[PDB]
């Protein structure tokens, strides 16, 4: 999404349930691999936040 082509919006968004596995990105998808600071990238698929 190119809507947030600025710095003031911030999109003010919240997620209710995110149960998308990390390995699903290999199903012919062209999405860049997630990079996480302070925690290993796979922690999204392992633990809760």
């Amino acid at each position, epitope marked *: 999404a190119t809507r947030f082509a600025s710095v003031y919006a911030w999109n003010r968004k919240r997620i209710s349930n995110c149960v998308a596995d990390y390995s699903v990105l290999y199903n012919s998808a062209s999405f860049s*691999t997630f990079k996480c*600071y302070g925690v*290993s990238p796979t922690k999204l698929n392992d633990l809760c936040f």
Partner: nanobody
Amino acid sequence: QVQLVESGGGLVQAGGSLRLSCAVSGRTISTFGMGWFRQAPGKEREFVATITRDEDMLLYADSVKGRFTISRDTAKNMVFLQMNSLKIEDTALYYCAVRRDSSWGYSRQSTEYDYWGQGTQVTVSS
């Protein structure tokens, strides 16, 4: 100015294999997170690869995706980067992962690390 010391350097045979390990101990990569990056001739910065604690998937750089490999050991407490199928274009200074500001994490961006001190000069030619 002082320059970072890394294993290797000098002329490297094309298509060979070499190891890249940091030698300095004042600012180890572990403090800022294990990783490696190289500066191409001029003022261009790029990322090569890094090893994640999971050990199941390694963050690969699109430029060298599927080329470089990293070995892992339980008690060595060190990370060694191994290069495969070297090319003439690989000629570039190699730097140890260091950040100008305090931070910790894993990432796959070219501008992840940068420092004033120059790195080991590696020349690759046929």
